[PDB]
């Protein structure tokens, strides 16, 4: 079971909207190289390696954890899509 899956299912009206929000957020993290995250340094997911602890490379794992903090906003007709990417690219070149 994914951690906090019960709370994630309670945040949306339809279970398929949760999958849409998670998948689009993970694409945002991959495209900007995880520099747009809302997580604090002590909250970043980690994986254990022979050389030491490093950042978790799985973007889907990051998206689920961010959505549990309450710092993301999701909905329909929030912003124009072209204007969303332009500002996010300017903030995170």
């Amino acid at each position: 079971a994914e951690p906090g899956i019960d709370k994630l299912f309670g945040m949306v009206d339809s279970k398929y909207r949760l999958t849409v929000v998670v998948a689009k957020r993970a694409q945002q993290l991959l495209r900007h190289g995880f520099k747009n995250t809302v997580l604090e340094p002590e909250e970043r997911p980690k994986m254990q390696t022979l050389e030491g602890l490093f950042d978790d490379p799985n973007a889907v794992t990051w998206a689920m954890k961010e959505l549990l903090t309450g710092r993301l906003v999701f909905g329909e007709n929030l912003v124009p899509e072209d204007r969303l990417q332009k500002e996010m690219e300017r903030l995170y070149p």
Binding site: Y16, A23, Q27, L30
Partner: protein, 1114 residues
């Protein structure tokens, strides 16, 4: 290790030769060694005399005799060079000129006839093959009731298959008796008039029934002459053709009276005479002579029909599934049938050649073209449903293959259109067809086995032996009888108690026409020979069969065919008594011909000097690869200077131990759950099995490659392959072939080959790259043979065939072919399948170190742990009794023979367990040890479970548990006992052909299909997995829209999408959006070829181009 035998029934005859159904039938057809003048009119001799003489209608070609020559190549040479083991056929013909009277004789070469090996198989194009016997409805005359309307019957006349049409005789509601031929129904009187039957003749014999004869008394055609009736009948049969007497008599005579076209058969003629009570001169419906037709069978058939409808006591309907109405076609008859087909084609080319071209100057050799005859025989032995790839996983596998009976094939039933009734166990199957051995699935009841004591008679009916009983005493006279003959007697069971030869029981269990009855000893007429005559060879190898459910006994007998030979194979502790004869009749071992002395013993050959003085040398087959990939070799069992008797064993064959069938190992088994690794048929084993090489088998694989002539140039097998390092070419010799003894792994080169590159100028980027490094492109490319993924081993043999070599027939354009044999030694591993003879099977899921296994108080650990939850719902209790008897033999050091339905019983097993306890526990007391503290704890619970008697001493209570097959067992991980006594014993377990090594496969990308551009299928092709319709439904029910779209486009046939996805992943990116699949583009084009305009539109109904503008005419 001594052998103890149970049972009371004394068999008066031994088993017949187990391959005589194949061997004896093919000898009768050929008649190869019978002198020509003493040959009987059977087999291919009967076919020669049927087609000949050939008359032009003044030239006659006649047949005198034939002979068979020596084979050109031996059996082992044919296997190596991919030839057919055959013999030339010569015919001695003479041509007679009727006008003049001059005769010429010469011998003409007719072709080659395949030869059967001593064990009963053929070598066709270098591969072993088996001809399977066919069962079908017997020809004759049959009477069945009318299903639509009661009180009415239908009479049928059935010839041999493809030897005439079926004839139906029915009484219509109007009262007219009608005859139906070739889907056409016409009154019977029209044909019955052609046979010269008048009004006075018909009413004399059939007028003793009533209103039925009135329907045969029409005066419209009674006065009509037989010649006029003949022409009128011809118009009804084939309307449209001009009515001529010359054409009319040709059709009628050729439909029911021509022996070359209509054949009732020897079995059919015998059936017709027995039923109708008549005597037939030939095998046709009517006899034509003196320019007229004469009746042979039509009148007696009609009398039976009328009398059956009237209700005379002596006439009854026929059961079509009765085994007296079904017959077997063996290999000799099936081969001879195709020989007659091809011979009729040869006579057709003789006729067209003797009326056109040099009629006055002819020779028999110039008339005869044997090409049609050879094509008929070649087609039968290659592409017939009954000619099958031989099963030789072990010697028992090939023996069973030769005794199978199939209802399918040419002239047989179809798998899809076969109903329930034809698949059932008929009551006449008793003693003739095994009731339990059959495949489950779409072939159930359509493929069966011959009973162990059965034999097929000359007409094709199965007979089973019975003992004559006279006046209450049983004699040793044995009579073989068919099902129809068996129905007339009261037959007692084989277990009937006897005092010598006198029947001792007052009440006897017997059968009367298949049903059980209780009778007095004076009413008995016959007796069964043994219980073994009811079952087949495979089922007869299962001990305690009477304690097993038939659904699980079917699995046990089938899976003995799939057992692989082991390097340390041994015979089971508990046997039935057929293990010796199976090895002997399979011809896999070597026996002495007569008394003599062994002179030379080697791993390759044995030389025996016989008492007449002559020396005989026997070469040994060593490390040979079978059709299934298992190694077959023979190991000598004698020493130099040893005296041998006639029939003594000289060398063991595969899966045999001192002449006994050995399909597995004898292991120590505990029946208990273990930590969930036994869950749902899974099996736990010990690492000690691997340490002593139990369940270790040898397998051999073959690889091949060719060097051809091409337009660009010839392919060359060479060691000098471009762009290859020395590490890759290390194990190749100077000729480019891997050396013998090398160890190969996936990706290693086996044979090196180069091919001339096709003419194609390179891409601009490559041209600049070659300019930078100053390298000149070569004219050849690497096309060498490499080890496929997941394979490998040791190279043990190479074979090189070249064009021009004697006996080598290579295809045009092929220069040479190289073959490499690779062998590996397989130990048991997780994922391998194991089974016993009672139908218990499962895969190995866990291998434990020896200190983890449960062990006996003396320190002995068990080998295998089986879950007790698989027993109760399968109801196969035979494995429990085998375990109890194997526990007694472990301590007493003896083996047992318990025949089926007459063998070991619990009081005898418990008397043996009492002796085994005296050595299992009396040994401990002498050594100075008492009862363990841990055994006292288990005994305290055992009497709360009601297993032991309260008040007894611990030694007496331990013996009470031993007589039930239970011991106190310790846990290896903790050292504490299991809380209850556990059943422990010895069991015989086989390792099956299905191994996880041959079945694991994976793929990322690979070959694609031509038209649909989708991935190929199959592990051998490196193909992908089929994601079918029901799998698509599951993804839809989940709501996984994006996962479903990837499988439809990005991973099957979106050519642009699958290229972009691969490039994105190797760059560390997410895969892009998919596009239109290619198979949809194919569907649009194929619909346009059907003149249908299919167009894709957008929201505004405007056209959308999905072909990128590549198919639009500007």
């Amino acid at each position: 290790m001594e052998i103890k035998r149970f049972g009371r029934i004394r068999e008066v005859i031994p088993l017949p030769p187990l391959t005589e159904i194949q061997v004896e039938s093919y000898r009768r057809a050929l008649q190869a060694d019978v002198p020509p003048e003493k040959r009987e009119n059977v087999g291919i001799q009967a076919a020669f005399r049927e087609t000949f003489p050939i008359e032009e209608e003044g030239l006659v070609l006649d047949f005198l005799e034939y002979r068979l020559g020596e084979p050109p190549f031996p059996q082992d040479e044919c296997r190596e060079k991919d030839l057919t083991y055959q013999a030339p056929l010569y015919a001695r013909l003479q041509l007679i000129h009727k006008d003049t009277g001059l005769i010429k004789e010469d011998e003409v070469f007719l072709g080659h006839i395949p030869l059967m090996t001593e064990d009963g198989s053929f070598i066709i194009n270098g591969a072993d093959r088996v001809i399977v016997s066919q069962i079908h409805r017997s020809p004759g005359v049959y009477f069945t009731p009318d299903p639509a309307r009661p009180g009415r019957y239908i009479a049928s006349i059935i010839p041999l298959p493809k030897r005439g049409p079926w004839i139906d005789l029915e009484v219509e509601p109007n009262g007219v008796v009608s005859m139906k031929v070739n889907k056409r129904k016409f009154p019977l009187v029209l044909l019955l008039r052609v046979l010269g039957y008048d009004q006075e003749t018909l009413a004399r014999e059939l007028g003793a029934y009533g209103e039925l004869v009135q329907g045969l008394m029409d005066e419209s055609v009674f006065a009509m002459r037989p010649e006029e009736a003949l022409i009128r009948l011809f118009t009804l049969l084939r309307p449209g053709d001009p009515p001529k007497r010359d054409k009319a008599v040709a059709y009628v005579y050729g439909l029911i009276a021509d022996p070359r076209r209509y054949d009732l058969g020897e079995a059919g003629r015998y059936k017709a005479e027995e039923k109708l009570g008549i005597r037939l001169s030939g095998r046709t419906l009517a006899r034509f002579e003196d320019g007229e037709f004469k009746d042979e069978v039509f009148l007696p058939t009609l009398r039976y029909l009328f009398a059956l409808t009237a209700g005379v006591p002596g006439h009854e309907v026929d059961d079509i599934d009765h085994l007296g109405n079904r017959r077997i076609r063996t290999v000799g008859e099936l081969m001879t049938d195709q020989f007659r087909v091809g011979l009729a084609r040869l006579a057709r080319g003789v006729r067209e050649r003797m009326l056109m071209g040099s009629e006055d100057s002819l020779t028999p050799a110039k008339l005869v073209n044997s090409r049609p005859l050879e094509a008929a025989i070649r087609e039968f032995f290659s592409r017939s449903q009954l000619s099958q790839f031989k099963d030789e996983t072990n010697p028992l596998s090939s023996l069973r293959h030769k005794r199978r009976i199939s209802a399918l094939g040419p002239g047989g039933l179809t798998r899809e259109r076969a109903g329930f009734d034809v698949r059932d166990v008929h009551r006449t199957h008793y003693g003739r067809i095994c009731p339990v051995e059959t495949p489950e699935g779409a072939n159930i009841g359509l493929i069966t086995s011959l009973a162990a004591y059965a034999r097929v008679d000359e007409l094709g009916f199965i007979r089973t032996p019975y003992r004559r009983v006279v006046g209450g005493v049983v004699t040793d006279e044995v009579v073989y009888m068919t099902a129809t003959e068996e129905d007339r007697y009261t037959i007692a069971q084989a277990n009937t108690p006897l005092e010598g030869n006198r029947i001792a029981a007052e009440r006897v269990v017997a059968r009367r026409k298949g049903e059980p009855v209780i009778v007095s000893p004076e009413e008995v007429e016959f007796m069964d020979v043994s219980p073994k005559q009811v079952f087949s060879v495979n089922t007869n190898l299962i001990p305690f069969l009477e304690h097993d459910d038939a659904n699980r006994a079917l699995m046990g007998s089938n899976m003995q065919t799939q057992a692989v030979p082991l390097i340390r194979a041994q015979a089971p502790v508990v046997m039935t008594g057929l293990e010796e004869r199976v090895v002997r009749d399979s011809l896999a071992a070597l026996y002495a011909e007569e008394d003599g002395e062994v002179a030379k013993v080697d791993g390759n050959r044995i030389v025996v000097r016989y008492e007449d003085g002559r020396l005989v040398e026997y070469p040994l087959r060593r490390f040979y690869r079978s059709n299934q990939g298992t190694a077959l070799d023979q190991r000598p069992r004698v020493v130099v200077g040893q005296r041998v008797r006639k029939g003594d064993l000289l060398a063991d064959g595969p899966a045999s131990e001192n002449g006994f069938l050995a399909l597995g190992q004898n292991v120590l088994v505990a029946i208990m759950p273990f930590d969930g690794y036994n869950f749902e048929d899974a099996i736990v084993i010990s690492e000690e099995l691997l340490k002593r090489d139990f369940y270790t088998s040898i397998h051999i694989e073959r690889y091949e490659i060719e060097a051809r002539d091409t337009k660009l140039g010839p392919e060359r097998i060479t060691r000098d392959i471009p762009h290859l390092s020395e590490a890759a070419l290390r194990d190749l010799d100077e000729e480019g072939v891997v050396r013998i003894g090398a160890e190969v792994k996936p990706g290693d080169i086996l044979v090196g080959r180069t091919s001339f590159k096709g003419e194609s100028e390179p891409t601009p980027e490559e041209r600049l790259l070659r300019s930078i490094f100053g390298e000149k492109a070569r004219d050849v490319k690497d096309t060498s043979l490499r080890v496929p993924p997941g394979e490998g081993g040791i190279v043990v043999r190479t074979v090189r065939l070249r064009r021009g070599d004697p006996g080598v027939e290579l295809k045009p354009g092929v220069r040479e072919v190289v073959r490499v044999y690779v062998a590996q030694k397989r130990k048991l591993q997780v994922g391998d399948k194991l089974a016993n003879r009672h139908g218990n099977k499962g895969v190995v899921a866990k291998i434990l170190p020896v200190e983890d296994m449960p062990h006996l108080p003396d320190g002995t650990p068990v080998d295998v742990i089986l879950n007790p939850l698989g027993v109760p719902s399968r109801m196969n209790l035979g494995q429990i009794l085998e375990t109890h008897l194997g526990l007694a033999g472990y301590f007493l050091g003896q083996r047992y023979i318990s025949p089926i339905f007459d063998g070991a019983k619990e009081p005898e097993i418990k008397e043996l367990l009492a002796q085994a306890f005296e050595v299992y526990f009396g040994k401990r007391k002498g050594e100075g040890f008492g009862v363990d503290k841990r055994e006292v704890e288990v005994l305290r619970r055992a009497e709360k479970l009601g297993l032991v008697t309260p008040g007894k001493t611990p030694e007496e209570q331990l013996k009470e548990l031993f007589l039930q097959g239970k011991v106190v067992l310790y846990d290896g991980r903790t050292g504490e006992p299991i809380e209850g006594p556990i059943v422990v014993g010895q069991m015989f377990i086989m390792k099956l052909y299905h191994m996880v090594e041959d079945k694991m496969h994976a793929r990322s990308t690979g070959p694609y299909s031509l038209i649909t551009q989708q991935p190929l299928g199959g592990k051998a092709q490196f193909g992908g997995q089929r994601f079918g319709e029901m799998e698509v439904w599951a993804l839809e029910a989940y709501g996984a829209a994006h996962t479903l779209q990837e499988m439809l486009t990005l991973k099957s046939d979106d050519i642009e999408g699958r290229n972009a996805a691969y490039e994105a992943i190797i760059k560390g990116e997410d895969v892009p959006e998919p596009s239109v699949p290619e198979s949809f583009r194919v569907l649009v084009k194929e619909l346009q070829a059907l003149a249908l305009d299919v167009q894709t539109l957008d929201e505004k109904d405007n056209p959308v181009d999905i072909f990128e503008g590549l198919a639009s005419k500007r």
